[PDB]
Ligand binder design. Structure first.
Ligand SMILES: *[C@@H]1O[C@H](CO)[C@@H](O[C@@H]2O[C@H](CO)[C@@H](O[C@@H]3O[C@H](CO[C@H]4O[C@H](CO)[C@@H](O)[C@H](O)[C@@H]4O)[C@@H](O)[C@H](O[C@H]4O[C@H](CO)[C@@H](O)[C@H](O)[C@@H]4O)[C@@H]3O)[C@H](O)[C@H]2NC(C)=O)[C@H](O)[C@H]1NC(C)=O
Ligand SMILES: *[C@@H]1O[C@H](CO)[C@@H](O[C@@H]2O[C@H](CO)[C@@H](O[C@@H]3O[C@H](CO[C@H]4O[C@H](CO)[C@@H](O)[C@H](O)[C@@H]4O)[C@@H](O)[C@H](O[C@H]4O[C@H](CO)[C@@H](O)[C@H](O)[C@@H]4O)[C@@H]3O)[C@H](O)[C@H]2NC(C)=O)[C@H](O)[C@H]1NC(C)=O
Ligand SMILES: *[C@@H]1O[C@H](CO)[C@@H](O[C@@H]2O[C@H](CO)[C@@H](O[C@@H]3O[C@H](CO[C@H]4O[C@H](CO)[C@@H](O)[C@H](O)[C@@H]4O)[C@@H](O)[C@H](O[C@H]4O[C@H](CO)[C@@H](O)[C@H](O)[C@@H]4O)[C@@H]3O)[C@H](O)[C@H]2NC(C)=O)[C@H](O)[C@H]1NC(C)=O
Ligand SMILES: *[C@@H]1O[C@H](CO)[C@@H](O[C@@H]2O[C@H](CO)[C@@H](O[C@@H]3O[C@H](CO[C@H]4O[C@H](CO)[C@@H](O)[C@H](O)[C@@H]4O)[C@@H](O)[C@H](O[C@H]4O[C@H](CO)[C@@H](O)[C@H](O)[C@@H]4O)[C@@H]3O)[C@H](O)[C@H]2NC(C)=O)[C@H](O)[C@H]1NC(C)=O
Ligand SMILES: *[C@@H]1O[C@H](CO)[C@@H](O[C@@H]2O[C@H](CO)[C@@H](O[C@@H]3O[C@H](CO[C@H]4O[C@H](CO)[C@@H](O)[C@H](O)[C@@H]4O)[C@@H](O)[C@H](O[C@H]4O[C@H](CO)[C@@H](O)[C@H](O)[C@@H]4O)[C@@H]3O)[C@H](O)[C@H]2NC(C)=O)[C@H](O)[C@H]1NC(C)=O
Ligand SMILES: *[C@@H]1O[C@H](CO)[C@@H](O[C@@H]2O[C@H](CO)[C@@H](O)[C@H](O)[C@H]2NC(C)=O)[C@H](O)[C@H]1NC(C)=O
Ligand SMILES: *[C@@H]1O[C@H](CO)[C@@H](O[C@@H]2O[C@H](CO)[C@@H](O)[C@H](O)[C@H]2NC(C)=O)[C@H](O)[C@H]1NC(C)=O
Ligand code: NAG
Ligand code: HSM
Lengths: 333, 333, 333, 333, 333
């Protein structure tokens, strides 16, 4: 009977003060939370933030909304949520979050006979994640979503994960093009500020970055250019022009590769591992050119010593570069 | 008689409760749906999403809105839609969507004497499509648009296509630049979540990326540079300058092509077939240059051995390149 | 008497029903439309759309608003437009449009003694224009703005241009940095959909691109680089290093030019005219380098043959390039 | 007495008709405008528009709001501006303007005992400024802001700058990194349209561009490269490789500079002064290389003629470049 | 008893007039402001602005809201903030600011028994901060946040930091990668405009840029290229091709590095210190090439003088560059 249900809803909402929390002046209202992660849209190191779309649901108990005589759970229209009390839950570290509004506001209100209220939203947020990219791209990020009550202290509200360790779902279905979610954690605690103690929930992901693309697109050209520089040591004895032309081509190619690659890398202004590796390759080709210059300078007066120096460099350069490569791949793994 | 129509409408809306679905507590309301796709703006591989503009239409029946004495269809102003009940339909896999509002909100409400309601919106949505670019650019994508009620379960609402396979129209007129609509499919089903069973409609497009410019511009340069690296072998000593020029040209052109195609392609992190093809061609030409360097170094010592190495390279390099190309092509096509 | 005018307006708006169109259940209400174009902000080929700012004016006759005793055209505050029926006019091919709202909403309501209503808005609309860049940058586009009633069919409303071909003004004052408006047309007709017949207005512009910037930026440097690559023919063959360096550097310059210019071009899936010209220049310079390689290979055997080949090249390359330029410029113009 | 002030304000607003302008049916209302420019955020040549943040104040007299018994100016809350008549003032040439809304809407209403109303807003407008970049980067631009009534005509409203030439303040404190505000002018007039005459105010700035950055980073590298190209003439003509490499690498460096400058400089579909200068330098280096080619071709038969041509080139090329620079700098300054 | 609290609140708001400030026509209302800074999202030199997120809390006393019988602080729902009077506080140097509204408007209202009101917001604002980038990338910037009453003068409202110097917290926790916060200052004063005197609060940060990234990616390549241009000196002057090619290769590499760095570095329209350093390095390599040109011109007639010139240059160029670098690093540090 629609008229009877309308009468019940009007009776519930009449004399109902939306400005007062449930059990005002009494025990805090326990609010449980569920997060169904639809998808992690993207992760950006330039802005150091990740975009996250989720179904965020809050469960609590408002005795003023308890009804009797109806053996049903009333799934009301979303607009009635504007006439109820809802927790002032906000995301601590978000930068731009919104609730989808097509074709209507993605909002669900479900009343229960015992006064229990379920309130669901579909939120696309952009949470800030500070990233330690000193080991980029061989890095590992820990990005968290923080949930807190904005106004009410722990004396008026409490947050708990509804469902224990399985309160957050959908993480296993996330397809991140570059990262792999190694682990996710749920944390509940109380934080302290000048006004008092606030409840706090935290959903943490550990993202591990794939390195195949960097290996097959970033390091390999530099290694090949270094080998091409090494080729110079086995070019004639008096090729004062062809050998220096090969070195010139090597240096110009190294500069072009570094410039274009840094263009194809995030513009974050601090030293990274790939920057160190490219600097090392540049220093190595520069040292090869310096060795050629010194050999050419001493070639006319002491040809035997020049040839000996060239032969010794033929071994020293690959060995020193391999030592540097080993210490680099062991320092960053 | 506008006065009589206005009185009838006022009687219809007097006592109407938008917080209660039609036939509340009884059978679920069957909501039929039509989509008329105006156009698809773009299918971005970088963000893995596609923009779609459509004339979404919902058809249902609310017996509270049935009117008598007017043997016509009441095409009311869109604002009356705020005073009625509308389903909480939302697109499950959208990242941003809006209803156009110029000059007025693009919205149509039509009432029939038997309580039938037709509700039209003009919606532009950026729906997420997780592409698979392993076989890029010869891959075939499948991008879907999902439609699902938010709050009401199957006990309160049911979805179906109004017109069978003719429910969605305008697909054949989609002017996609880089894709072609191979086939569009309409699916209806139910999905069980922790909160119950919900209806689901799906509109899926299969897109075959046009080979075209990709074949005509990407693989051919690499093949030609490999052919040049081959023809660099049939060089005697007196034409050594020409061989040096050919080798340097091959290396520089390969590097420039690699950088250009890694800068002017959708910046997806993970590797793909084209990347492996380009790296293989680079490796082949680099190894050809290394072979020339070894031949030049050992030419003075044992010219017969150097000539034998040159001839064996002439025999082997095209054969190995052809084997690599065939295994790559049958591994991806 | 301001109070008397207030009483008259209140009497006009007392009992007025916005949800019902004028002449409801009778002849369709004729609406005459004027457009005063302010400027065309941009015409993006990347997004294939143009931004257009205009004053959109609608003219109809709602006899429910007819008043007597005040021989003046009542210019009312724009907010009263929220209390009147206005046509659900929308733009068929827009993507993102809005009405400026600073300092107030750019909206104008003017009532006339015979019930005539004039309703003006200032609209900035991004209309999609699916271009044809096969002849880029010598193309001639045709971009249209489509105006249609959303909910009401031709039985309820009938659009027409108020003033004939003079219904659209401000075309001559449009300042397009790149294009030049050749012609504009106004079309009025009816279009049939499954929901009935709808009025349709179309405002079409034909835009002709200006090629001077592309002439100086691209077409001249490519020609100069090709002519410079032709220099190697006059250089004596015995100076192998000079010709090798010239060919390699011309190839590298052409590669850099092509890469930068393509990166400054959209990713449409077909080859434009400028791409054809750049590819032709690249082919010419690469062929000159290969011709030098062939001459340096065969000069040891038959020096007279090599000299004859060079003397033939000095005529063939300029003649072939002149023929290529002639066919390219005649084909596209 | 707060209650007495509340009663007076309510009596002022009781029976107030916001739909009618003050003194309706009589003399037009006089609106005096002040602008206090906080900053000019940016100037963009790509979009040809400038961002402008201002305090915009309007002064008029509505005798319906006159009150007695309170010898004080009533600074009311901004929300009361939604209950008062305000002029429909808009900016004729803006594209995206808004009123700031943190913490509250930046808006001020001040009522005077004689009924005078002062209405202040904080507006950030992106105004469209057409620019003549024929003399970029040596150009001087003129950017205007147009203020006009939308609905009311000269028979209903009249604009005048309040304070004469001191109406607009804050101009001297504007800090444009690239421009310098030479002058600003205030103009008041009437514009005729099909709907009658409308008041119009215009605040115009004349901005002169700073050229130090363009001298350091743009002209100087080109001049240095052109000078470096002349090194070829002071090298012995038998060293074919050295001079060929010099000419071709100068051409390559000039191409790199030109392309990267075009990428960095704002996009424009026409020819600028800087482009003319770059093309001139390119022509000079191209002619230097061509002259060297002529010398290398004719040196064997007539070494005396080759030496004479080299001496004439040494005399002419610096002289011709100096003359070209002198005429270029005299024409554009 | 929640009904008692509801009655108390209704009595508080019975007849409350939001349009009137507390003690209207009396002493000015003291507003104490606290700021809890969460993070600084970015600091931009292209736009000269920084993004700041903060908990902004205002403290004042409204006697109209004083209540008795409830010995507790009433933390109300944020929506009640629309039913009270709040200061028209705004930020004087902001460009785009908003209050986060997920899952609700991040806003807090707390009423104290003595009528004291605490009103908190969570605000993200893009505050303009003009920068003196002459010493970039070794500069120290000063960015200020200005807080002022928009409509009320010092006769009606007074701003003061609440808690003394401890009014702003969270500064030490700001994680800026590129910059490093040195000192933050709080200033309180009154400014005088044409209308009257307005209160003003200012929060100033002094940021110091970090130069390690610039040193290891922007200065070292130039230093290495200059050292290579030096090593060009030790080649005997007879070899024209080698020295000429090395000098011009250094010039071309310097130009490419400069252009790609200007692309990667911020695009500000005026001169910095890095630009002067790059111009100095370019001048050094240019002078090295010119010196070799002079030596190659005079080597045949004056071999002793040419040898002496080379020997002297081998010490002069390193010494001159060392002096230039010492001057540069002492001037800017
Ligand atoms: C990314 O980085 C963040 C930190 O920046 C990590 O978050 C931390 O996660 C750990 C768990 O892995 C948290 O440690 C746990 O804190 C709980 C809360 O402590 C508060 O409340 C208790 C009372 O309930 C107080 O006693 C305490 O002082 C705090 O006020 C504890 O309840 C947990 O205790 C668990 O272990 C102990 C033994 O050590 C047992 O006795 C307990 O029963 C229980 O099992 C625990 O200490 C830590 O607080 C988090 N920090 C923050 C800032 O959130 C993320 O985990 C990381 N990401 C990933 C993927 O790891
Ligand atoms: C892009 O990729 C998506 C998948 O990711 C494809 O979507 C699938 O489309 C197929 C059809 O092409 C769907 O298969 C159909 O499912 C219907 C629903 O079945 C569900 O419900 C029933 C109970 O009602 C369950 O028993 C069942 O397990 C499912 O949960 C079926 O009714 C269909 O059956 C049809 O065929 C059978 C014979 O095979 C007949 O007996 C039936 O009468 C009927 O004709 C059918 O099986 C599939 O469910 C879709 N997947 C998803 C996840 O929705 C898109 O098609 C693809 N894009 C393109 C262009 O192809
Ligand atoms: C950019 O491209 C668009 C098309 O994509 C062009 O728009 C077309 O413009 C032409 C006119 O130049 C339009 O053709 C005209 O259509 C009118 C409307 O037809 C409807 O109404 C009539 C009855 O009035 C019906 O019979 C008909 O079936 C339609 O329902 C016609 O009235 C016009 O008639 C012309 O020809 C007849 C002879 O056949 C003459 O007697 C008339 O006097 C008149 O000359 C005409 O047919 C066409 O419809 C437009 N296309 C679309 C899709 O609307 C733009 O012009 C182009 N841009 C530029 C700048 O040219
Ligand atoms: C950027 O470029 C714009 C133009 O595109 C410049 O704007 C022009 O500014 C000049 C002033 O510098 C304007 O000229 C003045 O116009 C006034 C208004 O005239 C109108 O209204 C009067 C009635 O009030 C009518 O009679 C008249 O026909 C117009 O309809 C005049 O009052 C001014 O007259 C003054 O000078 C004359 C002599 O020239 C005297 O005889 C008068 O007594 C009086 O002293 C004057 O003519 C011009 O109108 C503006 N253009 C436009 C389109 O409005 C900007 O100045 C420029 N930017 C900068 C920084 O300079
Ligand atoms: C970034 O740049 C801004 C400026 O753009 C700097 O802001 C300035 O900060 C200084 C303090 O470091 C301010 O100077 C202070 O002004 C106060 C206000 O003076 C007015 O009001 C008093 C009465 O209260 C009048 O007497 C006076 O005439 C003014 O009308 C003073 O009260 C302060 O005095 C304090 O210091 C002095 C010693 O310097 C003591 O003798 C006093 O007893 C007292 O302790 C002081 O003079 C200045 O006004 C600010 N400028 C602006 C425009 O706000 C930032 O500091 C800078 N960033 C950083 C990190 O430094
Ligand atoms: C209405 O809500 C109640 C409470 O959530 C539902 O009761 C659940 O019923 C399922 C079995 O159907 C049990 O497994 C759960 O444990 C019950 N919940 C609790 C808290 O005991 C009830 O099913 C719902 N009814 C409808 C029609 O939605
Ligand atoms: C009101 O709308 C209904 C539904 O579109 C119209 O009924 C249709 O009439 C056509 C013939 O004109 C039939 O082919 C359809 O099958 C009918 N559909 C239904 C659902 O009945 C009806 O004609 C309209 N009213 C008027 C006066 O035209
Ligand atoms: C709460 O206080 C109100 C107002 O005094 C009173 O009417 C009501 O009866 C009280 N409720 C209880 C349970 O005492
Ligand atoms: N243009 C009227 C609405 C419509 C057309 N097609 C589908 N819906």
């Amino acid at each position: 009977n629609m008229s009877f249900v309308k009468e019940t809803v009007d009776k519930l909402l009449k004399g109902y003060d939306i400005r007062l929390r449930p059990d005002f002046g009494g025990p805090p209202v326990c609010v449980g939370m569920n997060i169904d992660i639809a998808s992690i849209d993207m992760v950006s190191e330039v802005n150091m933030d990740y975009t996250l779309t989720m179904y965020f649901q809050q469960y609590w108990r408002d005795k003023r909304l308890a009804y009797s005589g109806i053996p049903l759970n009333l799934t009301l229209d979303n607009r009635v949520a504007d006439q109820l009390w809802v927790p002032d839950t906000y995301f601590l570290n978000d930068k731009k979050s919104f609730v989808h509004g097509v074709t209507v506001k993605n909002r669900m209100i479900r009343l229960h006979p015992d006064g229990t209220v379920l309130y669901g939203l579909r939120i696309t947020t952009t949470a800030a994640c500070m990233m330690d990219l000193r080991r980029y791209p061989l890095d590992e990020q820990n990005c968290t979503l923080e949930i807190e009550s904005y106004g009410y202290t722990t004396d008026d509200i409490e947050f708990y994960w509804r469902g224990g360790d399985k309160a957050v779902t959908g993480v296993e279905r996330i397809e991140l093009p570059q990262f792999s979610i190694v682990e996710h954690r749920l944390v509940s605690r109380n934080v302290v500020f000048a006004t008092g103690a606030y409840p706090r929930l935290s959903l943490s992901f550990r993202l591990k970055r794939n390195i195949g693309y960097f290996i097959l697109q970033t390091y390999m050209p530099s290694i090949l250019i270094t080998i091409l520089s090494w080729v110079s040591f086995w070019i004639n004895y008096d090729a004062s022009a062809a050998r220096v032309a090969l070195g010139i081509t090597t240096v110009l190619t190294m500069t072009t590769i570094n410039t274009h690659l840094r263009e194809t890398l995030p513009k974050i202004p601090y030293v990274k591992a790939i920057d160190m590796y490219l600097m090392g390759c540049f220093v190595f080709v520069f040292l090869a050119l310096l060795e050629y210059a010194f050999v050419n300078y001493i070639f006319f007066s002491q040809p035997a010593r020049a040839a000996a120096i060239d032969r010794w460099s033929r071994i020293v350069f690959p060995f020193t570069f391999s030592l540097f490569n080993l210490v680099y791949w062991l320092y960053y793994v």
